[PDB]
Each structure stands twice: as structure tokens, then as C-alpha cells.
Amino acid sequence: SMNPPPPETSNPNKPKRQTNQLQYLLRVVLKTLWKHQFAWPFQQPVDAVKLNLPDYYKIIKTPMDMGTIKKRLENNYYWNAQECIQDFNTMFTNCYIYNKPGDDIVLMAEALEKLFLQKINELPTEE
Numbered sequence: 001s002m003n004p005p006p007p008e009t010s011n012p013n014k015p016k017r018q019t020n021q022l023q024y025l026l027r028v029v030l031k032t033l034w035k036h037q038f039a040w041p042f043q044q045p046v047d048a049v050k051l052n053l054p055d056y057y058k059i060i061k062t063p064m065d066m067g068t069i070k071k072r073l074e075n076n077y078y079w080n081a082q083e084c085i086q087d088f089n090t091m092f093t094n095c096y097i098y099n100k101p102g103d104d105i106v107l108m109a110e111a112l113e114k115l116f117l118q119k120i121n122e123l124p125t126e127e
């Protein structure tokens with residue numbers, strides 16, 4: 001069962017900004033999670049064909065991954081920090097929705113989420 005196109009990462013007509021909070025989301029939050037030993041399953045859209053998960057995009061209707069987030073941050077795609085924070089939370093939630101408690105993929109997401117929460121706890125006040 002086929003893969004959908006990836007989430008949008010480019011849109012010239014979308015209003016967008018670089019803010020100090022969005023800079024922190026790239027330089028601290030994304031960079032910290034990306035380098036982690038458990039990042040790799042989350043570094044690109046789920047290939048439900050290669051993984052033989054024909055139900056994946058039937059259950060997960062708002063897919064998100066760090067590859068997409070990375071491109072959005074590098075392209076300054078976002079208007080505000082909350083939009084990016086929502087993408088991270090969608091990614092984590094999607095993992096917990098699709099999978100079973102205690103599964104390896106869930107343990108991996110939980111480790112990344114713990115770090116995510118620690119970093120966003122120190123999100124700087126907007127300049």
C-alpha cells in the first residue's frame with residue numbers, strides 16, 4: 001500500500017519568520033535530537049512500503065518526522081515557535097498512536113521526547 005507525498009516543506013506564499021525562538025529550535029532542539037542514537041527511525045518520513053506497513057498512512061493522517069522539521073527550519077518555513085513545537089509533538093503522538101506500549105520504537109520516541117521537553121523548557125523569551 002503506497003506512500004503519500006511528504007508534508008509540505010516549501011511554500012513561497014506562506015508568511016514566515018526567523019525568530020530567536022525558531023533559531024533555538026534548530027540550533028538546540030533539532031540538533032540535539034538529530035544526533036541521538038535513537039534518531040534514525042525519525043529522520044525521514046516512514047516508508048510504509050519498504051517496512052510493509054500497509055495500514056500506516058491509513059491510521060496516521062497527519063504524518064511528521066524530523067527530516068521534514070529539519071527542512072522546514074532550514075527553509076525558515078514557520079511563522080512561530082509553536083508551529084514547530086506542534087510538529088515535534090505530532091511526531092511523538094503519531095508514534096504512540098500507531099505502536100504498542102513498550103515497543104522498541106516507542107522507547108526510542110520516549111527518549112527523544114524527554115530531551116525535547118528538557119530543551120523546550122528553556123525556550124528563550126521572544127526578542
Ligand SMILES: Cc1cnc(Nc2ccc(C(=O)NC3CCN(C)CC3)c(F)c2)nc1Nc1ccc(Cl)c(NS(=O)(=O)C(C)(C)C)c1
Binds near residue numbers: 041053099
Ligand atoms: C517513526 C516510526 C513510527 N512507527 C513505526 N512503527 C513500526 C512498527 C512495526 C514495524 C515492523 O517491522 N512490523 C512488522 C515486521 C514483520 N513483518 C512481517 C510485518 C511488519 C516497523 F518497521 C515500524 N516505525 C517508525 N519508524 C521506523 C523506521 C525504520 C525502521 Cl527500520 C523501523 N523499524 S522498528 O520500529 O522495528 C526499529 C526502529 C525498532 C528497528 C521503524
